[PDB]
Structure formats: structure tokens, C-alpha cells
Enzyme design. Sequence first.
Site, PDB file in Angstrom:
ATOM      1  N   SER A 104       0.799  -1.213   0.000  1.00  0.00           N
ATOM      2  CA  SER A 104       0.000   0.000   0.000  1.00  0.00           C
ATOM      3  C   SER A 104       0.836   1.269   0.000  1.00  0.00           C
ATOM      4  O   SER A 104       0.267   2.343  -0.192  1.00  0.00           O
ATOM      5  CB  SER A 104      -0.945   0.002   1.203  1.00  0.00           C
ATOM      6  OG  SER A 104      -2.046  -0.854   0.948  1.00  0.00           O
ATOM      7  N   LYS A 133       2.964   6.440   5.855  1.00  0.00           N
ATOM      8  CA  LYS A 133       2.072   5.612   5.048  1.00  0.00           C
ATOM      9  C   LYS A 133       2.546   4.172   5.153  1.00  0.00           C
ATOM     10  O   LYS A 133       3.741   3.903   4.982  1.00  0.00           O
ATOM     11  CB  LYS A 133       2.056   6.028   3.570  1.00  0.00           C
ATOM     12  CG  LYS A 133       1.114   5.169   2.719  1.00  0.00           C
ATOM     13  CD  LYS A 133      -0.317   5.373   3.202  1.00  0.00           C
ATOM     14  CE  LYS A 133      -1.320   4.392   2.602  1.00  0.00           C
ATOM     15  NZ  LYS A 133      -1.285   3.103   3.305  1.00  0.00           N
ATOM     16  N   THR A 134       1.618   3.257   5.421  1.00  0.00           N
ATOM     17  CA  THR A 134       1.941   1.863   5.694  1.00  0.00           C
ATOM     18  C   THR A 134       1.473   0.955   4.562  1.00  0.00           C
ATOM     19  O   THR A 134       0.805   1.370   3.609  1.00  0.00           O
ATOM     20  CB  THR A 134       1.299   1.415   7.006  1.00  0.00           C
ATOM     21  OG1 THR A 134      -0.106   1.673   6.931  1.00  0.00           O
ATOM     22  CG2 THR A 134       1.890   2.181   8.196  1.00  0.00           C
ATOM     23  N   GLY A 135       1.846  -0.308   4.686  1.00  0.00           N
ATOM     24  CA  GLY A 135       1.274  -1.364   3.876  1.00  0.00           C
ATOM     25  C   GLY A 135       1.570  -2.687   4.542  1.00  0.00           C
ATOM     26  O   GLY A 135       2.489  -2.792   5.362  1.00  0.00           O
TER      27      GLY A 135
HETATM   28  C1  LIG Z   1      -2.081  -2.099   1.524  1.00  0.00           C
HETATM   29  O1  LIG Z   1      -0.974  -2.622   1.839  1.00  0.00           O
HETATM   30  C2  LIG Z   1      -3.405  -2.624   2.054  1.00  0.00           C
HETATM   31  N1  LIG Z   1      -3.218  -4.001   2.432  1.00  0.00           N
HETATM   32  C3  LIG Z   1      -4.237  -4.968   2.070  1.00  0.00           C
HETATM   33  O2  LIG Z   1      -5.202  -4.600   1.483  1.00  0.00           O
HETATM   34  C4  LIG Z   1      -4.048  -6.434   2.471  1.00  0.00           C
HETATM   35  N2  LIG Z   1      -4.788  -7.323   1.593  1.00  0.00           N
HETATM   36  C5  LIG Z   1      -4.497  -6.551   3.918  1.00  0.00           C
HETATM   37  C6  LIG Z   1      -3.590  -6.938   4.892  1.00  0.00           C
HETATM   38  C7  LIG Z   1      -3.979  -7.025   6.219  1.00  0.00           C
HETATM   39  C8  LIG Z   1      -5.284  -6.719   6.572  1.00  0.00           C
HETATM   40  C9  LIG Z   1      -6.188  -6.319   5.594  1.00  0.00           C
HETATM   41  C10 LIG Z   1      -5.796  -6.230   4.267  1.00  0.00           C
HETATM   42  C11 LIG Z   1      -3.902  -1.736   3.265  1.00  0.00           C
HETATM   43  N3  LIG Z   1      -2.450  -1.314   4.184  1.00  0.00           N
HETATM   44  C12 LIG Z   1      -2.412  -2.198   5.227  1.00  0.00           C
HETATM   45  C13 LIG Z   1      -1.592  -1.656   6.308  1.00  0.00           C
HETATM   46  O3  LIG Z   1      -1.112  -0.500   6.198  1.00  0.00           O
HETATM   47  O4  LIG Z   1      -1.370  -2.314   7.353  1.00  0.00           O
HETATM   48  C14 LIG Z   1      -4.026  -2.211   5.671  1.00  0.00           C
HETATM   49  C15 LIG Z   1      -4.319  -3.404   6.564  1.00  0.00           C
HETATM   50  C16 LIG Z   1      -4.400  -0.926   6.424  1.00  0.00           C
HETATM   51  S1  LIG Z   1      -4.814  -2.354   4.162  1.00  0.00           S
END
Ligand SMILES: *C(=O)[C@@H](NC(=O)[C@H](N)c1ccccc1)[C@@H]1N[C@@H](C(=O)O)C(C)(C)S1
Length: 261
Positions: A42, A206-208
Site C-alpha cells: 500500500s 504511510k503503511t502497507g
Molecule cells: C495495503 O498494503 C493494504 N493491504 C491490504 O489490502 C491487504 N490485503 C491486507 C492486509 C492485512 C489486513 C487487511 C488487508 C492496506 N495497508 C495495510 C496496512 O497498512 O497495514 C491495511 C491493513 C491498512 S490495508
Amino acid sequence: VSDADFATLEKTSGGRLGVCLWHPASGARYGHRMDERFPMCSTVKFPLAAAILHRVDAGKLSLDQRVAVRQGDIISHSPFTERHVGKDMTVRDLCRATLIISDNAAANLLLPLIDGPAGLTAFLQAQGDRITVSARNQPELNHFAPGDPRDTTSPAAMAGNLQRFLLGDVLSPASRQQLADWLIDNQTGDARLRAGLPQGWRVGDKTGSNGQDTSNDIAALWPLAGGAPWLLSCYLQGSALDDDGRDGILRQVGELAGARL
Ligand SMILES: *C(=O)[C@@H](NC(=O)[C@H](N)c1ccccc1)[C@@H]1N[C@@H](C(=O)O)C(C)(C)S1
């Protein structure tokens, strides 16, 4: 305080840790695997937002223009865009949603305004980032395979992008400060770099996460006392630790960076 400290932290990290702590005003730089490729996840949303604001600054876009939301646009983890099916949202609100809560459909609705992942990559190249490659939209941009450069960046490249878009004048002063306020309002990083960082520093980040073995956190660190900010780029890929465990690594990256401030 040294490059060795991050390499040591990697050993307990469970996987491949990449860290770039960089102070543009002094040229100080610390980290580990700073030029290796890591899946953005993300964190690609941060250059996406900057690309949008650059097109707004150029008059090719308006923050107040509205994008229609259809049911087919909605995908997992889209808390704001899922409420607007059948109506529209301003570009500015789309940007804020994708940044501060990681609205995934919001990202997918913004990408076509800058000509998709290839258009994002071209913007990054024009602005000086020749490493980052944005290839797919959500959710498949979260796929990573070693040797496959799609949707990857490097800790140095993303620290560079933080500097370009928040500190340089790629963007108009209004745009660069709005972008900063969005990072400052991030809702997803409380257990990550922020939890390890010392008092006296304003954090925008900003995370992912891919939900299984990868967690990333990129941040700007402004001294509340005023003065020159630091940028902190962290990518943890293929770790044996889960999200809470990887949060603990990101927290410790913040603790090491905090000592060198
Ligand atoms: C981007 O990295 C997004 N990640 C996801 O959509 C994954 N499929 C996901 C992981 C864990 C839980 C839900 C979805 C968003 N960035 C992540 C983060 O910053 O930790 C999120 C969980 C906020 S979604």
C-alpha cells in the site's frame, strides 16, 4: 546510530529488512538493504497521491472534480469508497481516504486519472525515481516474487520520494502541505515506526501489509522544535513474524532511528 545496528535488527526480524534513515539537510544516511527491491504494497499510494497533486498543480486536474463510484469498483478494505456507490467523491477526498486509512478502491479510482500504473511509473521517472515500478492496481499490486520488479521500490527510492514531494518543490506549497497533513493524519501506523520514535517529532507516514509476511512503513519526521526533517523508509518482506510481530520490528526501527536524531 550506525548501519550495523539495522543489520543486527534484521536477524531477529524473521526476513528481509530494508531501512533508509536520511537527513537531506546534513546528508546523513543510515540503513540496510537500501537499494534492494521490496514490494511496495500500500505504500504505492503515497506516490499515487503526489502524482495526482502534480496534475492538479499543472491544471490538468482539480481536487474538487468528482469521480463516480460504481459497485464493481468496490474491493476489500475500502471503508470510505464503499459508502459512495451510485454517487461520486472529490479527488481530494479520494486521496485522503487512500492515504490515511488505505482505502483500496480509492487507489483504483485515482490511478486512471494519472494514466494508471504505467502513468504513475512515468511520473516517478520524470521526477527522478528510476527504481520504483508501479505495474498493477489493487489487489494484485500486493503480489511479490523475487526477481519480479513489478510494484517494487527500494528504501532509498521511497525516502527520495518523501524528500521530493514533501520537502522539495515538485509540488506547489499548498499541495505539498496538504500531502503532509494527510500523512500526519495517517490512521494505520500507531503500532509501527511511531511507537518507537522519541517525543519531540511530528510523524507523517504511510503503511502497507500483505497480511501474511510483509509490512512497510515510510515516514517524514519533523522536529516539533522546528528545523530540518528526517525521512525514514522501512520495508520488511518475507518475515516469519505476523503483522503484530512485524509491527514490533517496525517499532524497533523507530527506536534505532530515534537514537540517531
Ligand atoms: C495495503 O498494503 C493494504 N493491504 C491490504 O489490502 C491487504 N490485503 C491486507 C492486509 C492485512 C489486513 C487487511 C488487508 C492496506 N495497508 C495495510 C496496512 O497498512 O497495514 C491495511 C491493513 C491498512 S490495508
